[PDB]
Symmetry: D2
Subunit: 494 residues, 4 copies
């Protein structure tokens, strides 16, 4: 483990690449356009980064189209594509310190987190899809004997991925890992709030043997994301972000060329703690992690803690104690568990919910902006006790603000849990076999954790929304359906 001083010294010597990566090479944006890539830690300008517009999106899409239709990557045998993707992941791992530091500088995420969750998660995602390429195939149908009936999957062609700033490298890889394994060309549009790791891994991709045009990164703001959703030559768009943008993406997809559109959106995920919870200390610590990890900037954040009246007093005590480890600090410091909020606008939005919370609920802990003098954006881990219809209980805050909701019986907790337009995740804590399975079946969410929350990172578990928390799944073999088409081939022999 490197020390704070070690990370600070590396940050001082770090050469940061800000150019787009398009068709096998770094490029400035057309006409010399840039934006300032600012660090949430302290407001320092890290780099000028390409600000792409239509000329650049069009160049990226054309190169992707050219490379797909030429079969430079789709036409490789399964084992050969697996070998390239493994090499890229190995490279990510070889450059883990650099990539981790870029992520922590760019997005304010603790270095203890980026070195262990974000960069290894990205590399694992790429490796797992690489390793799956040559293990699973299509079907020979049980059809009439005069036919040879085959059902196969083929890459869709050109895939656009627009990803958010809360997990820049990790969400990026959840898109490009499966899309590339399937043989697609990819145009990735990282958030203007976190372009750097995307850019960096693009360079490593080409170094590993991903052909020119197969993996392109187009930094910029809203416009290049629009243009990719509208593009006549993009076959699929995969987005993780907010709902207004998500609803916009689906609309331009349909209105243009009916490109496949796949969204992973926000949540107001409920975390239900029952009296027979096997370990109330682990549950309280995990309830804190569920909402304060990555500064609450987690679509699956456990932002509604539903707790049974019988254990509520003791549980809230343990929660408050747990919240202490998440006092904000410099994310370059490896001992820090809560880093910086991504920018002032996000900070202000979070403080606005904290203000609503003060009026409608009981403040249990936290609630203040801190370290304003650093030039960065920091807010204490904050807990309120509220009714389930409170503003902060209903609306996604995307910050370290927990809504604690009391209930008297399990069916009530289930009713409150499901009373939302969101459906990304849920959890229940209970020692009882029947309760565990019965409640887990009834929670209307894509991921249900039992006696855990945000547990591990296993690629076998598809991840995504019911209702308005997105369509389709990331992770697992089911992720590949978003980036392939089915084909039935009926071969008549006589």
């Amino acid at each position: 483990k490197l020390t704070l001083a070690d990370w600070q010294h590396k940050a001082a010597s770090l050469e940061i690449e800000g150019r787009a990566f398009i068709d096998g090479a770094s490029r400035d944006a057309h006409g010399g356009r840039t934006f300032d890539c600012v660090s949430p830690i302290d407001g320092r300008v890290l780099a000028k980064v390409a600000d792409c517009g239509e000329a650049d999106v069009n160049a990226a899409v054309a190169a992707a189209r050219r490379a797909f239709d030429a079969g430079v990557w789709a036409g490789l045998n399964p084992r050969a594509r697996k070998a390239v993707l493994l090499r890229w992941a190995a490279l990510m791992r070889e450059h883990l310190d650099e990539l981790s530091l870029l992520e922590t500088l760019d997005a304010g995420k603790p270095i203890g987190d980026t070195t262990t969750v974000d960069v290894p998660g990205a590399a694992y995602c790429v490796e797992w899809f690489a390793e799956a390429i040559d293990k699973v195939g299509g079907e020979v149908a049980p059809a009439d004997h005069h036919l040879v009936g085959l059902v196969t999957r083929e890459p869709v062609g050109v895939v656009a991925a627009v990803v958010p700033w809360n997990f820049p490298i990790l969400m990026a890889a959840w898109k490009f890992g499966p899309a590339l394994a399937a043989g697609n060309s990819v145009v990735l549009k990282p958030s203007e709030k976190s372009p750097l790791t995307a850019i960096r891994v693009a360079q490593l991709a080409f170094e590993a043997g991903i052909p020119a045009g197969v993996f392109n990164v187009v930094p910029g703001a809203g416009e290049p994301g629009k243009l990719l959703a509208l593009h006549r030559d993009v076959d699929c768009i995969a987005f993780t972000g907010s709902t207004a943008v998500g609803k916009l993406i689906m609309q331009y997809a349909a209105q243009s060329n009916l490109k496949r559109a796949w969204l992973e959106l926000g949540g107001k995920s409920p975390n239900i703690v029952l009296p027979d919870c096997p370990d109330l200390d682990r549950a309280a610590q995990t309830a804190a992690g569920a909402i304060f990890y990555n500064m609450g900037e987690m679509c699956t954040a456990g932002s509604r803690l539903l707790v049974h009246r019988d254990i509520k007093d003791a549980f809230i005590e343990k929660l408050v104690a747990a919240a202490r480890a998440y006092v904000p600090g410099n994310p370059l410091d490896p001992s820090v568990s809560m880093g910086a909020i991504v920018d002032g606008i996000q900070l202000e939005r979070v403080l606005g919910y904290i203000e609503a919370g003060r009026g409608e609920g009981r403040l249990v802990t936290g609630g203040a902006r801190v370290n304003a003098e650093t030039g960065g954006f920091y807010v204490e881990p904050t807990v309120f006790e509220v009714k389930p219809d409170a503003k902060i209980a209903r609306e996604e805050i995307f910050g370290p603000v927990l809504s604690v909701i009391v209930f008297d019986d399990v069916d009530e907790a289930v009713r409150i849990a499901n009373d939302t337009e969101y459906g990304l995740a849920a959890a229940v804590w209970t020692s009882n076999l029947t309760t565990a399975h019965d409640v887990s079946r009834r929670l209307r969410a894509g991921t249900v954790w039992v006696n855990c929350y945000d547990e591990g990172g296993d690629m076998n578990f598809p991840f995504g929304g019911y209702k308005q928390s997105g369509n389709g799944r990331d992770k697992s073999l089911h992720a590949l359906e978003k980036y392939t088409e089915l084909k039935s081939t009926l071969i008549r022999l006589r």
Copy 2:
């Protein structure tokens, strides 16, 4: 049964035109109806409930109530299987009635409705019913401190908006899997073909599909748009034109992000090479591929790509094959070519025929016939054209073939794939490597080799690449449109 027999049965038929909502035949709220007109002769068959906002809301509310009570979703897999099999068995018991309704309503030959449409609907239901208790979820190879499950659950309330070219068959393609998975369904059949949907809704209730769980709301574009926009619908499945599909996707997105699954148009290429195994079967099948169901088929083999070396002899054979498709009364069991659905649709087809006269070579057909009947009939029509011709590019949805010559396989594949459609394609060749190589290169959901529109097997997912739709009907893959995946991570220690 003879033509006279079917006319007699038609005269004796008591036709139900009301909606079927929440266990009951109901007029539209406020009592409005539209006239259901037969394309055979323009005769009014029935006055059909012309449903609007209040009806849509009542159907959706009952579907929601039923789903939440678990009257259907809460039945064991074998118990839902039994009810669905009983419903298909009632369909088969009522096969003459259903087949006659479909022929009267949509102008489809009784020789087809009795053998393709109605049995095809039953089969779909029966196949999904039989699959319910055969396939499950996953136990993940997860770390040992976890029990990791991956399961599928019904989405809840499913709306299904279906077209008039195969009314009962396409309806079943939606409701068979959606109901097997446990969802409540609200079906909005085309205003051009409401009758069989209404009749199966009554049979559904009779078989034991609980009130609320299967509803039919007749009417035109408005209730379909309202279902697409509805706050309490979870999923909408649509089959129709690409242009209307685009609106459906926008309605879903704008409202509640309901899942939207479309099956859309096509301009499917049917490629015939010199080493085709049997040129006479190929020619007969090529005609069937564009004249079956009056060419009102999304997968119609509407571009016949033929190699220059066999083109002359092939066209001669095709013209001979066209003779079987003389327009006639679809109540006649010897008729293969029935009526176009209405006069607006007929005029669209005749506008494309007129376009083709101007840009290519008329080979055979091209005329509207038998106008004196009050019905809508057009000859089986063949043009030779270049691939950039309007009739070669645009979906006609009538019995109009574009014959396009090519010089080598690579050119055939380029021409085949140079379209925004992607529903189906075919190639005819005796060569092993050619059959597999070409079939891989064709960008379409279904590729037929040495066949076209072959059988109806439920194991083959069916749907679009590109602008011909997203997702698949038929096959276990159809169930994915009507369920959500859930990952359950149970931590033991």
Copy 3:
């Protein structure tokens, strides 16, 4: 519902078919061999049944081999085979009273059981496999692109099935249902102790449209089973029965022509009851049913009840109370829950084990032969408290004799459970989520029941042995692997 009197009037009027069914028609055995088919209810001779030997076995195998190699059944399309199988199952249901009565008379099984479990189960098995035929397929391998790689399953050819007398029609169907669905021809050799339902369903099969030679039934004792295991033209033998006979079958299979051999053998299945069991009363009732259902003539009988010391006394009281429902009685009486032991030799074997129990443990209830004046064979439901090492606790009895073993902790109960050469099934009763999953994972047995025992009869669950309780599985899609071969076809395009 038919009364005892109705079943009696029906039995007096019944015309019982005793001929073999070979190559599409009933046949006497070569040279007019028969045995007397005796009823265990009262020793009445029911019918004279063909006693097949070498000429009959060879006729049946030759007809099966002809029909398979001609493709009369294997060459039908999936849907066509499905319809025929479904029709046969429908005929079984149309004749449910007849087949249920045959079974009750032939093997002494309660009519309330044969009408509700045995015959519906046989029909459901056939139906489930018929329905599965056109739903699952082979593979298109993710192979190098110059190949089309297919992985398919093909019927093995001629399948011999040798089945026991404890569940005559049900175990027969568990073999023939999947074997026939896959397209094989079958030569079924039912127990000399229970030939009649097998014979009857062969006629129904032919009426349904199963072609001549595709389903054959050859009644007789051990000789035709020996011949089938040794036959040079049989490709597969599936057996259910005793271990020593299974060992003979496996040896004869190997030495003759390496025909596939698949065995379902006996058990000494442990049923573990912990203090946090959700419902001690249901646990006790189900423990009684686990050992007294079908006279304990059940390979999966819950014949070792492991109970925690803290609840042992209370549990044993409830067990004795539950045992009262299984007083032996006339199986033709629909109110009877436990019928006759199959024959005197079996009865004396069970009484021998009971004497052994008296020598090494404590008799809790039962213990005695009853109703000897009937000419039938009956023994009370019997319970002993014994040490885990006891003779009755180690060896399979195949009668209504329960070994109750105390334990002091869950690890001990797992060690006792697994300390056997058997591994057919096990069960644990606990309300705790972790215990349930942890214990069910550690139990070395093919079926594990949690908070139930011998629960329902769902076809999705493979059923069979670890260790010496057999190889391979009956029920589920996995049962098809016993009757098919894999083929990889590698098609090189260039």
Copy 4:
């Protein structure tokens, strides 16, 4: 590397002869050894542990203890994957050493062991390790009061007895999947090829496979018998002759009913039809099918069935293609056919060649060569025979081809299937229907079309119909041999 380089490596090579049991290299009971003799020139390479009952027992006990302690089975899937990947990477690091051991021990051309055997071993290990965290069990579509799981668990202690024609490769085909699934393995390699098995066991331990999880017990038939009869082995996987396999099954039956999975001999037909796309490739591949690895291949294309119309010409191309397999020193990288494993095997092959002279027509080869080297070599040999010839019926396990004429495709299929074997088959044809219809009709585990022994892809289950074995090596299907199914029915209410 050149001939000289391999020569220098061999002279310097240190060869380990001890057993590897319970994480240590150990002498056999009583210090007993046997001499490991190279078939290249008859030089003694090493004295190798000659294991008996005490050693078999120490290995099985160590495997049992490790399995019970869960030092390997209780690791998470990703953790087992990591160790197995490390081991395969160590094999590849040590490729030169391992290839040279295989060549010296079993006489296999160094050009083969370096490109096929050692990389195939590593790839098999890799592929199964990469698979362990991708595929899982089932959540059954059961009644709702139940949670029904269907999982797979490791069987426990797996014994593996493998032959001498592909020592490291067939060892790996067993231990790759068996270890991936969590089992402990006791490997008993052939007394004619102990060396790579021993070395890979050391490397396994190096890479982190725990003590007692992977053991190697060198020696002859007795230890293999002892493993098949062992009271505490749960499964035995055997590859070898059909006759010894029958014994393995009986040993399993008589003892503890352990699972027995056999990969046995063959007499595989290779059918060449007149419309073969490329007769020159087919002729050269036909030669490779029988002459590769000295014909010491269970899947050897040892019956070449050729249509009468192309027979003379095809035979002429076969004869040319044979010249490439002139026996040479296996340490020479330009050599394509090496040495027969020992004198007794050579005499067996020669006995068959003499049989052929009596019942057919000797086309080429026929002779023992290079006797002066002290090694065992025989020429690539071809006979024309009727299908009832002794050499056409019986497995020879040497470079001896039986060429059989046929007059039509039905006859070729009859002749191909008229054997008690069923390991593999092939057909060459350019016709789509012929290719699919013949491939379906051939009763063998692997059917090649327009190729033979094509690549080594791990996705294709390999193994016998009839008397060529039960079960399959390679693919996810290989795992079934080393796991049990469990149904867990969890009743909630």
